[PDB]
Design an enzyme around this catalytic site. Sequence first.
Site, PDB file in Angstrom:
ATOM      1  N   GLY A  17       0.818  -1.190   0.000  1.00 48.61           N
ATOM      2  CA  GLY A  17       0.000   0.000   0.000  1.00 48.61           C
ATOM      3  C   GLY A  17       0.860   1.251   0.000  1.00 48.61           C
ATOM      4  NE  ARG A  18      -1.055   6.178  -3.452  1.00 45.03           N
ATOM      5  CZ  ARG A  18      -2.026   6.973  -3.009  1.00 45.03           C
ATOM      6  NH1 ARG A  18      -3.184   6.464  -2.604  1.00 45.03           N
ATOM      7  NH2 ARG A  18      -1.839   8.286  -2.963  1.00 45.03           N
ATOM      8  CG  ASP A 117      -4.742   8.487  12.267  1.00 46.98           C
ATOM      9  OD1 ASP A 117      -5.947   8.807  12.155  1.00 46.98           O
ATOM     10  OD2 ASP A 117      -3.967   8.398  11.290  1.00 46.98           O
TER      11      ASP A 117
HETATM   12  C1  6H3 Z   1       1.192   0.640  10.819  1.00 56.93           C
HETATM   13  C2  6H3 Z   1       0.216   1.385   9.902  1.00 56.93           C
HETATM   14  C3  6H3 Z   1       0.329   0.968   8.416  1.00 56.93           C
HETATM   15  O1  6H3 Z   1       1.352   1.113   7.837  1.00 56.93           O
HETATM   16  N1  6H3 Z   1      -0.846   0.385   7.726  1.00 56.93           N
HETATM   17  C4  6H3 Z   1      -0.804  -0.024   6.303  1.00 56.93           C
HETATM   18  C5  6H3 Z   1      -1.659   0.603   5.414  1.00 56.93           C
HETATM   19  C6  6H3 Z   1      -1.655   0.251   4.073  1.00 56.93           C
HETATM   20  C7  6H3 Z   1      -0.790  -0.742   3.616  1.00 56.93           C
HETATM   21  C8  6H3 Z   1       0.068  -1.376   4.506  1.00 56.93           C
HETATM   22  C9  6H3 Z   1       0.070  -1.027   5.844  1.00 56.93           C
HETATM   23  N2  6H3 Z   1       0.975  -1.697   6.764  1.00 56.93           N
HETATM   24  C10 6H3 Z   1       0.980  -3.169   6.895  1.00 56.93           C
HETATM   25  N3  6H3 Z   1       0.293  -3.947   6.055  1.00 56.93           N
HETATM   26  C11 6H3 Z   1       0.304  -5.285   6.202  1.00 56.93           C
HETATM   27  N4  6H3 Z   1      -0.434  -6.188   5.290  1.00 56.93           N
HETATM   28  C12 6H3 Z   1      -1.340  -5.771   4.190  1.00 56.93           C
HETATM   29  C13 6H3 Z   1      -1.821  -4.466   4.088  1.00 56.93           C
HETATM   30  C14 6H3 Z   1      -2.685  -4.115   3.043  1.00 56.93           C
HETATM   31  C15 6H3 Z   1      -3.063  -5.071   2.114  1.00 56.93           C
HETATM   32  N5  6H3 Z   1      -3.960  -4.715   1.008  1.00 56.93           N
HETATM   33  C16 6H3 Z   1      -3.835  -3.427   0.342  1.00 56.93           C
HETATM   34  C17 6H3 Z   1      -5.081  -3.085  -0.471  1.00 56.93           C
HETATM   35  N6  6H3 Z   1      -5.388  -4.057  -1.392  1.00 56.93           N
HETATM   36  C18 6H3 Z   1      -6.490  -3.756  -1.977  1.00 56.93           C
HETATM   37  C19 6H3 Z   1      -5.492  -5.314  -0.850  1.00 56.93           C
HETATM   38  C20 6H3 Z   1      -4.271  -5.700  -0.011  1.00 56.93           C
HETATM   39  C21 6H3 Z   1      -2.590  -6.378   2.212  1.00 56.93           C
HETATM   40  C22 6H3 Z   1      -1.725  -6.722   3.256  1.00 56.93           C
HETATM   41  N7  6H3 Z   1       0.984  -5.873   7.172  1.00 56.93           N
HETATM   42  C23 6H3 Z   1       1.691  -5.164   8.054  1.00 56.93           C
HETATM   43  C24 6H3 Z   1       1.704  -3.775   7.929  1.00 56.93           C
HETATM   44 CL1  6H3 Z   1       2.634  -2.801   9.101  1.00 56.93          CL
END
Ligand code: 6H3
Length: 279
Positions: A17-18, A117
């Site tokens: 993600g972004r 947040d």
């Molecule tokens: C600690 C706050 C933070 O960084 N939250 C965040 C937000 C967006 C992306 C990543 C992320 N941090 C983490 N993500 C994951 N796993 C994960 C996140 C998001 C997805 N999806 C993105 C959207 N798509 C549509 C589907 C998949 C998948 C997996 N794990 C740990 C962290 Cl710190």
Amino acid sequence: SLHMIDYKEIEVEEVVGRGGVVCKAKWRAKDVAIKKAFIVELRQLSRVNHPNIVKLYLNPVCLVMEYAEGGSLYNVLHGAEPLPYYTAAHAMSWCLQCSQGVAYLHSMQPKALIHRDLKPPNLLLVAGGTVLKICDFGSAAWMAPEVFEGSNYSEKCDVFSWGIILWEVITRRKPFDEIGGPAFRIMWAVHNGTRPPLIKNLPKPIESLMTRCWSKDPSQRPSMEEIVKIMTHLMRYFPGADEPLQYPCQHSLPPGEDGRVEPYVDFAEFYRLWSVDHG
Ligand SMILES: *CCC(=O)Nc1ccccc1Nc1nc(Nc2ccc(N3CCN(C)CC3)cc2)ncc1Cl
């Protein structure tokens, strides 16, 4: 306290993600995530070890966090079709695990840590969507009014956010989507006392807890310790929170009218289990 990174053994694969940049990786055969002077503060806070907080595991600079297969609560609730089905038990369980993590941070010595947040995009889901983990850290819809009013704030501002989230997983609606527009329009709204519409057929104990969290005056909101106990005892009437999210759903959202809204989840089974105990 910390394990050091050499980068060589961190095998980056794909982008996540972004919201900074975030990437999936593998580190010692463990799926993990990774991401300017803000870490100086993160050294003092990284004494955290709680099941409902993302486990916080240097050239380029990197923070190594456990990976959450299931993505964000926000994406589960409102993301791209197909969206999963979930139940009242899931909604209550997510919120309960959220308040357990937030209570942990509130209880840290020497001083408590306010998350500030607290919102579904920072709540991650693991183990088939059944375990929620806070990812420590347009937020207008979840911000207590005293915070963007500038005035100093306590940890009661997280209680406010938690209240909004509870409305959100029950109704499967984005709070203040009807207002939208630029952020200041929602800030003006909630500062004047606007709150999400109350929920048709919601159980009075839950309505009472939710609205207490929404109080203008922060000192009338409950502590998170109190949240956790209430939610813990309520779960007796919401069996099923360990069932994986696996069933599809085609989510139809009727317009809001008569100042109330219908919930997504169904409390029928709660009123059943309740009346069995109460007479
Ligand atoms: C600690 C706050 C933070 O960084 N939250 C965040 C937000 C967006 C992306 C990543 C992320 N941090 C983490 N993500 C994951 N796993 C994960 C996140 C998001 C997805 N999806 C993105 C959207 N798509 C549509 C589907 C998949 C998948 C997996 N794990 C740990 C962290 Cl710190």
